Each structure stands twice: as structure tokens, then as C-alpha cells.
Amino acid sequence: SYTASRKHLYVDKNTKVICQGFTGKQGTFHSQQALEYGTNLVGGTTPGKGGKTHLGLPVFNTVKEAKEQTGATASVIYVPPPFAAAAINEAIDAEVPLVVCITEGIPQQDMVRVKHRLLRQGKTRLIGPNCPGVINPGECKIGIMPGHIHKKGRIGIVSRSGTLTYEAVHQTTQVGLGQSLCVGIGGDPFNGTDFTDCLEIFLNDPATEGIILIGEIGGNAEENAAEFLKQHNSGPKSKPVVSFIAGLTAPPGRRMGHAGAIIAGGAKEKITALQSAGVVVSMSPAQLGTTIYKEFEKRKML
Amino acid sequence: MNLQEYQSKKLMSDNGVKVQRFFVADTANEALEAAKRLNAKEIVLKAQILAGGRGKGVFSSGLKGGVHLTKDPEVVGQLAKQMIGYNLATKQTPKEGVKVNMVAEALDISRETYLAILMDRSCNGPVLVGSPQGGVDIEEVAASNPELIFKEQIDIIEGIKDSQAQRMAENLGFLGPLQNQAADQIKKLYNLFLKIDATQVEVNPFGETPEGQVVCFDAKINFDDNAEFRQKDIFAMDDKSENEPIENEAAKYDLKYIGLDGNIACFVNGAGLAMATCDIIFLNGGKPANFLDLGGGVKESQVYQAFKLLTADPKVEAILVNIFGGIVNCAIIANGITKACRELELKVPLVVRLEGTNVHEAQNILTNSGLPITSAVDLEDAAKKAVASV
Ligand SMILES: Nc1nc2c(ncn2[C@@H]2O[C@H](COP(=O)(O)OP(=O)(O)NP(=O)(O)O)[C@@H](O)[C@H]2O)c(=O)[nH]1
Numbered sequence: 148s149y150t151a152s153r154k155h156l157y158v159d160k161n162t163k164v165i166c167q168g169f170t171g172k173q174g175t176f177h178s179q180q181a182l183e184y185g186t187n188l189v190g191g192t193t194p195g196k197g198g199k200t201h202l203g204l205p206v207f208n209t210v211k212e213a214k215e216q217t218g219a220t221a222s223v224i225y226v227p228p229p230f231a232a233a234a235i236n237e238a239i240d241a242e243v244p245l246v247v248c249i250t251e252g253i254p255q256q257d258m259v260r261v262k263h264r265l266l267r268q269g270k271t272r273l274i275g276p277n278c279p280g281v282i283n284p285g286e287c288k289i290g291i292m293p294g295h296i297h298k299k300g301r302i303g304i305v306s307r308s309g310t311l312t313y314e315a316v317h318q319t320t321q322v323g324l325g326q327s328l329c330v331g332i333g334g335d336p337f338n339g340t341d342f343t344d345c346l347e348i349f350l351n352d353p354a355t356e357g358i359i360l361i362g363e364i365g366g367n368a369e370e371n372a373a374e375f376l377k378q379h380n381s382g383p384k385s386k387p388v389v390s391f392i393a394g395l396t397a398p399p400g401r402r403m404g405h406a407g408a409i410i411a412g413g414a415k416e417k418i419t420a421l422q423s424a425g426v427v428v429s430m431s432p433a434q435l436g437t438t439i440y441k442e443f444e445k446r447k448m449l
Numbered sequence: 450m451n452l453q454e455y456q457s458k459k460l461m462s463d464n465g466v467k468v469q470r471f472f473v474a475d476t477a478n479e480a481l482e483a484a485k486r487l488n489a490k491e492i493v494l495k496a497q498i499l500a501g502g503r504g505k506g507v508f509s510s511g512l513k514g515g516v517h518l519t520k521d522p523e524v525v526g527q528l529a530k531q532m533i534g535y536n537l538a539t540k541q542t543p544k545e546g547v548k549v550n551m552v553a554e555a556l557d558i559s560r561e562t563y564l565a566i567l568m569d570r571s572c573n574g575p576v577l578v579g580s581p582q583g584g585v586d587i588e589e590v591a592a593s594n595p596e597l598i599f600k601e602q603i604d605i606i607e608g609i610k611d612s613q614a615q616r617m618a619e620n621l622g623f624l625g626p627l628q629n630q631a632a633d634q635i636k637k638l639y640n641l642f643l644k645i646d647a648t649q650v651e652v653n654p655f656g657e658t659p660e661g662q663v664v665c666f667d668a669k670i671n672f673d674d675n676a677e678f679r680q681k682d683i684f685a686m687d688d689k690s691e692n693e694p695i696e697n698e699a700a701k702y703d704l705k706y707i708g709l710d711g712n713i714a715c716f717v718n719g720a721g722l723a724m725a726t727c728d729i730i731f732l733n734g735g736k737p738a739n740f741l742d743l744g745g746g747v748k749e750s751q752v753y754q755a756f757k758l759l760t761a762d763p764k765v766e767a768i769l770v771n772i773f774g775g776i777v778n779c780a781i782i783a784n785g786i787t788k789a790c791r792e793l794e795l796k797v798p799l800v801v802r803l804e805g806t807n808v809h810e811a812q813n814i815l816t817n818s819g820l821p822i823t824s825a826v827d828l829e830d831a832a833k834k835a836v837a838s839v
Pocket residue numbers: 404405493495500501502503504505515516518554555556557558561584585586653654666667
């Protein structure tokens with residue numbers, strides 16, 4: 148099943164990454180960031196550019212061409228929204244173990260179609276789209292997050308937000324706890340990876356001793372993650388979990404339909420729901436690091 | 450995105466979905482003469498606002514009721530004058546309501562059913578959401594008796610199967626020959642739902658007339674913003690009064706602007722991070738006037754218009770900049786802030802929090818600028834500073 152590919156979320160020293168949209172302006176920039184950070188970027192693709200070198204690495208026409216010749220195991224997509232969904236499908240066809248689609252703006256209908264087959268296979272794990280990516284502090288950085296704030300540590304960060312993810316990262320490094328693995332699942336409704344996937348990885352990673360979940364109002368993402376922890380992060384060796392949900396001060400949204408209300412039945416409910424699973428919700432976004440730190444001291448883990 | 454009923458219904462017309470024939474009118478006199486042009490027994494008048502619950506709503510005019518019908522055209526203008534320009538308030542509007550600014554051949558109703566097609570994560574794609582007991586009280590009926598709500602997931606590859614359309618039609622109570630006409634209308638709605646890249650198509654009531662006609666009496670369509678590049682003609686139809694002109698001029702340079710009632714104007718590179726800043730400002734006692742999102746892209750032009758825009762309305766005695774993760778060295782935008790601040794000459798305090806590539810050489814750019822620009826280190830610091838400006 149598709150869950151069998153969760154393991155591919157945990158990038159590391161060895162994963163060999165390639166870049167779809169390599170010559171693109173964003174592809175090039177964030178590709179350099181990865182090379183300078185130490186990520187093992189072995190090349191990228193760009194139709195009509197196969198056989199030319201870029202950033203000192205080979206460019207290929209398709210992904211299979213780029214995979215067999217480099218032995219890649221992860222891909223990061225910067226293809227523009229109109230063709231990004233196809234970029235994913237190309238990686239799945241090439242059975243790339245991990246695909247990280249950064250691109251924001253993919254039509255929901257495209258991703259509904261991508262995700263449809265994605266759930267019918269277990270070879271390729273997808274992160275995103277419209278996410279900052281995944282970063283193993285020190286070992287591998289797949290995405291746009293600034294690497295100069297991370298530090299290999301004991302805390303696993305899972306975030307549905309974007310730039311807000313960096314606050315939790317910058318605060319856990321400052322307190323000295325560092326990050327074991329930070330994953331951004333993005334803000335799109337139909338994605339390859341959700342909270343429950345990263346929590347499963349975090350709850351079973353020894354290097355992950357504390358957890359920070361970052362969310363925001365809207366949807367049921369946070370509640371589903373909450374019910375998971377309530378059924379798998381309870382009992383004996385329970386790993387402390389901290390959370391911050393942005394938007395408690397957001398105004399009403401102005402509806403135009405009953406559909407959303409009927410399928411539902413954000414705000415305080417997300418907060419108190421996470422609390423039900425024993426999660427410590429930091430009210431301010433500035434004290435995420437200072438909170439997880441103390442939850443570690445509450446049970447003598449420093 | 451969201452289009453008005455009359456616009457969503459014309460789309461339905463051009464795609465085999467049957468609705469009432471209608472005419473649009475800007476003034477209350479044209480609504481009266483246009484109601485005379487319709488030539489129909491009973492006529493229904495509806496207020497067009499990007500919001501539901503119009504029927505059970507109130508009016509700034511005290512008209513009480515966003516939808517009404519009568520067999521006397523003169524009553525159209527009589528009732529149309531009383532809302533053109535007023536704020537229609539419903540249980541979906543933000544209390545104040547929406548400034549109103551259609552006359553259709555009213556048809557007789559013998560049975561109301563709720564029908565909606567949408568993309569839903571839990572269902573991993575399209576869903577047929579229906580209930581035999583539709584009407585305005587759908588949400589109440591949905592809450593008191595959940596079992597009255599029928600869901601049918603659709604396979605995005607196979608599409609709407611006749612067996613699925615027939616089952617939904619049957620669950621909505623369409624018996625006899627109606628079951629086929631309704632099922633076909635369900636298939637024709639789903640196909641349109643996919644054609645237009647809609648996240649939601651809600652038909653409430655999905656009506657049954659005494660003459661055995663399955664009609665869509667109301668059309669609420671939500672369009673996927675991410676599909677605008679493929680839906681040119683449809684996104685061309687979004688009226689030129691989307692919220693407020695303060696919002697539209699912002700979007701001209703792709704800047705997401707959300708307005709509020711406050712004194713601090715936020716400026717963040719991230720929706721989630723923008724809502725967070727608004728939160729922590731609230732915790733410290735401030736109250737943000739709004740926030741202007743940057744997402745990821747950044748250009749010296751946007752910072753120029755960004756400041757020119759936030760200082761537009763006079764309800765901003767301070768602005769807060771919080772750029773944490775710009776794809777460009779903020780040392781470059783720091784000079785885009787100074788340039789966009791001394792040439793614009795703004796008379797409001799300015800709090801800046803930057804964190805990223807070479808932030809040391811960037812923070813001193815503001816300090817040694819001679820301009821009213823206070824620097825901040827963390828999110829908590831940025832908030833207390835912005836609050837400290839009264
Ligand atoms: N007899 C009759 N009643 C109508 C007609 N059009 C609307 N109504 C009545 O008006 C009610 C609500 O109007 P409608 O435009 O459908 O939607 P609404 O007021 O915005 N409510 P909601 O947002 O819940 O769909 C319907 O439930 C129905 O009782 C019509 O042509 N004939």
C-alpha cells in the first residue's frame with residue numbers, strides 16, 4: 148500500500164536528489180542552495196536540455212534518463228503549476244522513491260488525479276505540492292527552507308504552513324534541542340503526505356524525541372492528527388508533542404454554500420482537540436522552542 | 450473564487466443544465482420593465498451576493514428576505530428599489546452583510562432536494578453530496594438527521610457512472626420517470642463541475658416542478674483559483690467589486706491583501722506566518738489593520754507598491770514587516786524597503802523583522818538609513834514594538 152512508502156520521507160546523508168525544472172530560475176537557485184548545504188544533488192531535468200551541464204551537474208530530458216544514469220532516489224519539482232502535476236506522474240512512472248513537489252498553484256483537479264493513482268502504488272512517496280520540502284538537518288535538504296537555521300537534534304517538525312515552519316525550527320535550534328527531521332506537507336488539500344504520516348515516522352524514530360506540529364485554521368487536518376496521537380502516542384513511552392495553530396485571531400470567512408458545513412459539523416476546536424491527545428499547544432508562535440524545551444524538562448530528558 | 454448565481458446559471462445553461470430564464474438589471478426600474486419583458490405568470494426576484502442564506506436574511510433597508518416572488522411586475526421594482534445598494538445580511542455574511550447591486554420566470558415547486566458536487570479530501574476526489582430534504586433549512590436537517598444526507602464518491606478516471614447517478618436520484622426521492630431526468634441532470638452537473646475546475650457546485654433546491662421538470666433553482670459555484678490560467682473566460686467574469694478596491698489593486702501585482710479593522714498594517718511572506726503575526730500582535734495588545742502576503746516571490750517593485758498600498762487608507766498609524774525566508778537575500782529587500790520608504794515618504798512608524806541569508810549586513814541597512822525604521826530580532830520582539838506606537 149501507499150503507506151509502505153512513508154519510509155522514504157526520512158532523507159539522509161545517502162539519498163541522491165535530482166531537480167525537475169533544473170534550468171528554471173527557482174530550480175537553479177534552490178539547486179545551488181542544496182549543493183552548498185551538502186545535499187547530494189546529482190543533476191536535474193529540462194526538456195530540450197538533455198546532455199548539457201548545469202551547476203556542474205548533468206541535465207537530462209526525462210526522469211528515467213536522469214535516474215538510471217545517476218541512480219537518483221529523490222526528486223524535487225519546480226515545474227510551473229500548469230505542468231507540475233505531469234512532473235509528478237513522470238517521477239512515479241520512473242518509480243522515484245521520494246518526490247518533493249515544491250510548486251504552488253497546481254489545480255486541485257490535477258492533484259485529485261495524481262493522488263488517485265498515487266494511492267494505488269507503494270514505490271513513490273510524494274510530499275506536497277505547495278510545500279517547503281523536507282530537510283534532514285546536516286545530512287540532506289530537499290526544498291526551499293533556509294538551511295542556516297537547522298541543527299541536527301531531537302525534535303521532529305511537521306508543518307502544514309510554509310514560512311511559519313521556520314519559526315519552530317529557528318526556536319528549537321536556539322534552545323539547543325535541534326531538529327531530527329523537518330517535513331513540510333504544504334497547504335494544498337490534495338497532497339502526497341499528511342500529518343499522520345510524519346507523526347508515524349516521528350513516533351518510531353529514536354532520533355525524534357520531541358515533536359512539533361504546525362497547523363492553521365481550516366479543515367480537519369489537525370483533528371485527524373490529534374486522534375492519531377490519542378491512539379498511538381499514549382501509554383508508556385509517549386514522546387512529548389507541542390503544537391501551534393495560526394489564525395486564532397482570524398475573522399469569519401464569508402461563505403457561499405452549505406456544503407462545507409455539512410461535510411464538517413478551525414479555531415478553538417482544533418486547539419482543544421490537540422490538547423485531548425496530550426499535546427501542548429503554544430498560544431504564541433514565538434515560544435514554540437521555549438515550550439518543547441520545558442516539556443523535555445518536565446520528564447527529565449535534557 | 451465565487452461567481453454570482455446569474456453568472457453560474459448562464460454557465461449551466463450553455464452546458465445542458467436547465468434553469469429558469471432570467472434577465473439582469475442594474476437599476477430598480479430596469480428590474481420592473483425587465484420583469485415585464487420576461488412575460489411570465491409568477492416571477493421571482495433574487496439579490497446577487499457572493500453568499501448563501503439570502504432567503505432567511507435581513508436587509509439594511511429592513512426588507513427582511515433576500516428572495517421573494519409575486520405575480521405582479523410592479524411589485525418587482527417596488528421590492529427591488531428596497532435592496533439595490535443595501536447590505537443583505539445572512540447567517541453566512543459577516544453581520545454587516547454585503548452591498549447588493551435577477552428577475553427570472555418563477556417556477557412552481559413541488560419537492561426540494563439538496564444536491565452538491567465538490568472536491569473533498571476525506572473522499573479523495575469528487576463527491577455527490579445530496580439530501581432529499583433540501584431547501585434553506587438544509588444545514589439544520591443535516592445536523593438533526595445526518596442519515597438524511599447521501600454521499601457518492603466519484604472516480605476521477607472513470608467519472609460519473611449511470612449507476613451512481615441513478616442511485617443518488619433515487620436517494621433524493623426522484624421516483625418514476627423523474628429518476629432518469631434527475632440522474633441525467635446529475636451527470637450533466639458533474640461534467641460541468643469538471644469542465645470549469647470547480648471545487649464546489651451546490652444546487653439548493655434541486656427542484657421538482659408539478660409539471661415533472663427537474664430544475665436547478667439556485668446555483669452556488671466555487672471555482673478553483675489555481676485553475677484560472679485554463680479558465681480565462683470564467684475568471685474574466687469576476688465582478689469589478691471583489692471585496693474592495695483596496696484588495697484588487699493589490700492583486701494587480703499578485704499581492705494577497707486581507708483587510709481588517711485595526712491600526713497596524715502587517716507585511717509577511719507567508720499566509721500562515723501572516724496569521725501568526727496577527728495572532729501574536731493580538732497577544733501583546735495591538736490590533737492589526739490588515740496583512741499583505743508575499744508568498745515566496747519578491748521583487749523591488751512589490752515592496753514599493755506594498756508600502757504605497759498599506760498607507761492608503763488612514764487607519765494605519767504603523768506597519769510591521771516580517772520576512773522570514775525570502776528567496777532573495779533580504780539585504781536586497783532591506784535596500785528595497787529604504788528605497789520604497791524615502792521616495793514614498795510615509796509618516797507612520799515602521800518595524801522590521803528579518804531573518805535569513807546574511808541578516809547581519811541587512812539589519813544595519815535600516816539602522817544607518819536615518820529613516821523611521823526600528824529593527825526586531827524575533828517574532829515576539831516585532832509585535833511588542835509595533836504595539837508600541839500610540
Ligand atoms: N415557488 C418558488 N419558490 C422559489 C423559487 N426560487 C426560489 N424559491 C424559494 O426560495 C428559497 C431560497 O431561495 P434560493 O435562491 O434557492 O436560495 P437562498 O435563499 O440563497 N438559500 P440557500 O443559500 O440555503 O440556498 C427556496 O428554498 C424556495 O423555497 C421559484 O422559482 N419558485
